[PDB]
Design a protein around this ligand. Structure first.
Ligand SMILES: OC[C@H]1O[C@H](O)[C@H](O)[C@@H](O)[C@@H]1O
Length: 404
């Protein structure tokens, strides 16, 4: 019988790869279908380049791909339209915003699998130890808390201790972190939904200069090479007061044998001032059937199973990853395990998107521009003012003659 082959998630990032293979194998056992899991590199932009090799070749060697929320406009030609396979009632069980994101020129490229939003992780034990009752609401507060707690923990002999870790490596995760810095300073969305390239403004410049000012001071010098896992590893070992990361790090930090089990909470990221917007970059994964799959029916069945209530529930309970089904946010077992899913649901719903809708199939080029110009500020090569001017110019060239 057919062998259904899946590429999605990575064994290099938390438990995602391992869990994904387990789910695919469970489907295979349930249906009596042979399955194979193909592993992927950690970083989304590397995954995209890998999958593009299969797509360019029209390869039948992968039937199902896990695709990033930023990808439908790029990958649509390589996706089987799922719309004829789903009833309107079935589709309404997912958040409509994500179904819409995944629909490109009428083609439902992919089913919503898990969502994602950037959040602030904080050491509650250390806040209490140093006289703070709440996590920081403004970036200035975050800096002040980080300096005071670092001073004390260093003095007490933890030479590995930092105030803040985040994703500063030149890759897609930095575009996510930088959108949050820029938007939370009232500096806009980099490229607005209407197409306006707005990033050349003083608030965006200030956001980038602020981030530079962390490097080597409250954040390690090496933070300019950190992706999700590098940040998480410093944090999880007990060596950072604060971390910006995604939901998945919560379950990992709570696992038996984690140095920080029971010592942390999560909240919305800080912002420049009370009247700035909260920023949480929208992330997450969707499930695509390859246009080149020889087994569309079987692959659709697998995608439906993976996106089902009980599989998403398992993802939420065991891996603290966010459902794309609103009904799961009222599920007693989901909430007992992750009470913060309720507290932060409005943050998740109000997550700010990267400019993938407006950039469409040129999104990856736009994002590479963003992360390289932002990186040049983090490394000290450029100031924020020059970097946003140069970024404006780069994005104008990329998007010239593109309309949405
Ligand atoms: O590193 C950046 C990536 O981080 C997470 O995987 C998000 O789910 C994804 O949307 C984002 O592109």
């Amino acid at each position: 019988g057919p062998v259904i082959r899946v590429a999605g998630d990575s064994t290099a990032v938390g438990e995602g790869g391992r869990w994904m293979k387990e789910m695919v194998e469970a489907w295979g056992k349930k249906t009596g279908t042979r399955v194979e899991y193909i592993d992927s590199p950690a970083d989304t932009n590397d995954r995209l380049a890998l999958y593009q090799q299969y797509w360019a070749a029209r390869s039948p060697d992968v039937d199902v791909y896990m695709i990033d929320v930023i990808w439908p406009g790029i990958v649509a030609p390589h996706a089987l339209d799922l719309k004829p396979y789903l009833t309107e009632a079935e589709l309404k069980e997912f958040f409509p915003r994500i179904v819409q994101n995944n629909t490109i020129r009428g083609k439902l490229t992919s089913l919503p699998f898990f969502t994602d939003a950037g959040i602030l992780y904080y050491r509650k034990d250390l806040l209490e130890k140093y006289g703070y009752t709440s996590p920081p609401r403004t970036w200035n507060e975050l800096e002040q808390m980080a300096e005071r707690v670092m001073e004390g923990e260093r003095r007490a002999g933890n030479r590995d201790f930092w105030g803040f870790v985040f994703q500063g490596k030149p890759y897609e995760g930095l575009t996510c972190d930088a959108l949050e810095w820029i938007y939370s300073h009232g500096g806009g969305r980099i490229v607005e939904p209407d197409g306006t390239i707005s990033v050349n403004n003083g608030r965006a410049a200030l956001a980038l200069n602020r981030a530079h000012g962390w490097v080597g001071r409250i954040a390690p010098q090496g933070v300019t090479s950190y992706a999700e896992e590098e940040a998480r590893n410093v944090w999880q070992q007990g060596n950072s007061l604060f971390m910006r990361n995604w939901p998945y790090a919560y379950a990992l930090g709570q696992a038996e044998g984690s140095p920080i089990r029971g010592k942390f909470g999560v909240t919305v990221l800080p912002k420049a001032s009370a009247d700035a917007p909260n920023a949480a970059t929208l992330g997450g994964a969707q499930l695509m059937v390859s246009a080149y799959s020889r087994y569309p029916k079987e692959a659709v069945d697998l995608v439906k199973y993976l996106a089902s209530y009980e599989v998403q529930k398992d993802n939420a309970v065991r891996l603290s990853r966010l459902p794309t089904r609103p009904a799961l946010y009222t599920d007693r077992d989901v909430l007992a395990r992750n009470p913060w899913f309720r507290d932060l649901l409005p943050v998740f719903q109000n997550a700010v998107s990267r400019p993938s809708d407006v950039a469409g199939a040129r999104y990856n080029q736009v994002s590479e521009a963003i992360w390289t110009e932002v990186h040049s500020v983090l490394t000290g090569r450029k100031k924020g003012e020059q970097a946003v001017r140069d970024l404006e110019a780069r994005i104008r060239r990329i998007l010239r003659h593109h309309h949405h």
